[PDB]
Design a protein around this ligand. Structure first.
Ligand code: SF4
Ligand code: SF4
Ligand code: ZN
Ligand code: ZN
Ligand code: ZN
Ligand code: ZN
Lengths: 298, 297
């Protein structure tokens, strides 16, 4: 009686979903991942007369998200999909990673747009003499992607964050005790054409994203950062992993717990563009330390 | 340059506070622990014309908290301190635990009151017949209601509980991992309590290691008090998470707690025969009180 046949077709299985206790072959795993992503996005995102910008970085996540989104919008006529790669401009890596994303876009017919850090910002790599490097990079990338999505007049900005990436970030915000970082995430419903950040992979674990990348034979590139290595996220990932390894569905209950939390919690800027308040811009804080550069509003 | 002299007096040290990177001798550590507890309680708790009931269970925490509170209220003329021991009646050796707590109350002159679970309707002489849920949860929930009803009976202003920084960081993390917002809703709302006696935790910001070190220096005769009918492995797993986080990032337990304190201040704000209620449906928090036990007027 206790075998390993597929839950949907009773055929030999390739994946045992440790959370649910369900076995899935190649075909049934792809179908249930597509179903879960279709559920995550909803009918507001998956419909006609919709333009979706997507932040691609060459890794498994971006390419897996890019492939799934393309499969849906391929069978929708007036529903465009644009790919944005943001070249940080490092002497070490970054050059490799975007190459795998560009070659994917060519092979699958996705309109790509490579935008550089050394364009919107004057300095390509490091503001050496003081201030956090990995954070600075992520904050700017978000503002660049928002500005490119507005420029291309996109309805949504798709980001390849998986359930592990979200569970880690939630747990990090919990361990750090950040309520100010939790506050900025609060006002993210619908704002002045401020392109809505969608995460199609938000409920798919890293292992499933990786397994889906292997089965689709997607030529993804890891691209390790030569100027940033935060050991806290790798420590937090081990916490969430060991929690999942002892209690299946921990990562989901951690995330669902933050989703419920964010519901029950209660353009302003200078020169550039609105994000929260005028005061002294959080992005232009590092800009003030050097000198303000091109690309701004009226 | 790099020695080990005391941060407050420059004398050889007995404790290295791994989170602050500071060193304290016996006298300076006792003084900084007393200062932190004085800070946790405030002027409203540490003043004249108040009575403080305190849940004692015989362990280092309850005795350390009982000793500190007694030191303060000893010099305060019009302020009282009552100790309440709750024998759950769940057989085994709970008696040896209360024995250490009673013998402290005798040696230090604190008015003690031993109250039973069986005395407040039911039995619980191992009642679960064939902290998270079912046996361990039901015990903790009742204990709270018994302690509240003994404090009301003695007309106390506050109910002191021996929860330490480790105890508090773990519970917060458990509530985070479980994703409980309904259990988070119970905390707060009832901030303007009518009949409910205010639950104070003097040890709330003192880590378990400091509480234990303070117990050793004061030569307190505390009892181990182990449970023969409850062992929840999740809290022991969570404690290891909070410990390994502290061991790699000093002050993690405090930032986890301070993060929950800041969260609870910016968050969203029928029980027949007994009472409690306060924006809650059916038995409020009373696990059952129906069929298996009943017994009502
Ligand atoms: S790891 Fe590198 S590319 Fe990623 S946010 Fe940090 S600095 Fe930027
Ligand atoms: S460990 Fe034992 S005494 Fe403590 S709450 Fe659980 S059942 Fe009650
Ligand atoms: Zn199948
Ligand atoms: Zn700005
Ligand atoms: Zn000293
Ligand atoms: Zn009741």
């Amino acid at each position: 009686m206790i075998t390993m046949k597929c839950r949907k077709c009773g055929k030999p299985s390739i994946y045992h979903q440790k959370h649910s206790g369900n076995n899935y072959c190649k075909e049934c795993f792809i179908k249930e991942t597509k179903r879960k992503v279709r559920k995550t996005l909803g009918r507001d995102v998956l419909k006609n007369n919709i333009k979706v910008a997507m932040g691609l970085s060459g890794g498994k996540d971006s390419l897996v998200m890019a492939y799934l989104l393309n499969e849906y919008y391929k069978q929708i006529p007036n529903s465009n999909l644009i790919a944005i790669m943001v070249n940080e401009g490092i002497e070490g890596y970054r050059t490799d990673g975007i190459d795998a994303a560009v070659k994917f876009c060519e092979e699958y017919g996705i309109e790509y747009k490579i935008v550089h850090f050394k364009d919107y910002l004057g300095t390509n790599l490091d503001e050496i003499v003081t201030m956090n490097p990995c954070s600075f990079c992520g904050v700017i990338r978000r503002k660049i992607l928002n500005r490119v999505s507005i420029e291309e007049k996109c309805d949504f900005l798709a980001i390849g964050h998986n359930l592990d990436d979200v569970a880690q970030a939630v747990m990090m915000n919990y361990i750090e005790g950040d309520v100010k970082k939790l506050a900025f995430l609060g006002k993210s419903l619908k704002h002045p054409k401020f392109v809505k950040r969608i995460k199609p992979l938000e409920k798919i674990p890293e292992d499933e994203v990786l397994l889906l990348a292997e089965m689709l034979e997607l030529k993804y590139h890891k691209s390790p950062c030569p100027y940033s290595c935060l050991s806290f996220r790798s420590e937090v990932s081990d916490i969430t992993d060991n929690l999942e390894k002892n209690h299946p569905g921990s990562k989901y209950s951690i995330v669902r717990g933050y989703e419920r939390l964010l519901e029950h919690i209660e353009g302003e800027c200078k020169i550039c563009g609105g994000l929260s308040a005028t005061e002294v811009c959080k992005v232009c804080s590092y800009g003030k330390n050097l000198g303000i550069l091109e690309k701004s509003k009226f």
